[PDB]
């Protein structure tokens, strides 16, 4: 996350961190329930071995509530392509169920049609993660969050060199230099409705991080609600 701010205690409790064999975080996820983590298919390619950590705020200091969970099954969308990043969705089943706590709690999955007309049309959503705090910099040692405007889809296309399919959407600012970055991928984009947070996006890709005139691209969760349900059975 470039810009934005650190999440306070209990502020981003649906954030998961996927950690590699060096126990380093390379990607995020969104807690959907005690057994299920929502993430990006492409994150599957960015590690030889991984587990899921929940509850981390400062990754240089255990603080209580933190747990590591082994992944039992990876459900990857098999239409994912690294060429377009279309269908950038996967769901992880944990071996052992999460114990919800302060800083550990699911985001709500929305109803499809309703989310189309009423979440996707709010002004802002919130993206969160441990990723780099500058395009060329280092991962954050602290969970950050950033409020990001939804961006109309013709504006999204206009600005973008790569295709924007119906399974993606853009959010962010035009001149303000704040957006997701590397290490934030797979992580949550959520939208507040009457103080309940629903997951509306998966951190997917950007042309750099927080470049002027460019927006973060997210997998559009409302496009995949049936596939998500089925994956959670």
């Amino acid at each position: 996350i470039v810009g934005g701010q650190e999440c306070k205690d209990g502020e981003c409790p649906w954030q998961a961190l996927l950690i590699n064999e060096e126990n380093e975080g390379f990607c995020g996820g969104t807690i959907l329930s005690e057994f299920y983590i929502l993430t990006a298919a492409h994150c599957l390619y960015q590690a030889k071995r991984f587990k899921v950590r929940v509850g981390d705020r400062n990754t240089e200091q255990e603080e209580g509530g933190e747990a590591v969970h082994e992944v039992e099954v990876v459900i990857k969308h098999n239409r994912f392509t690294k060429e377009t990043y279309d269908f950038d969705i996967a769901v992880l089943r944990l071996k052992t169920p999460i114990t919800f706590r302060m800083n550990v709690a699911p985001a709500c999955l929305p109803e499809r049609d309703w989310a189309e007309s009423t979440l996707m049309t709010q002004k802002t959503g919130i993206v969160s993660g441990f990723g780099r705090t500058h395009e060329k910099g280092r991962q954050s040692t602290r969970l950050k969050m950033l409020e990001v405007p939804y961006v109309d889809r013709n504006s999204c296309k206009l600005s973008s060199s790569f295709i924007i399919t119906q399974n993606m959407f853009c959010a962010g600012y035009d001149t303000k230099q704040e957006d997701a970055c590397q290490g934030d991928s797979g992580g949550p984009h959520v939208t507040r409705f009457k103080d309940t947070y629903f997951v509306t996006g998966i951190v997917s890709w950007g042309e750099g991080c927080a470049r002027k005139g460019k927006y973060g691209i997210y997998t559009k969760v409302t496009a995949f609600l049936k596939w998500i349900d089925r994956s959670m059975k």
Binding site: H42, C181, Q182
Partner: peptide
């Protein structure tokens, strides 16, 4: 993440 033309 970072996808550059």
């Amino acid at each position: 993440x970072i996808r550059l033309p």
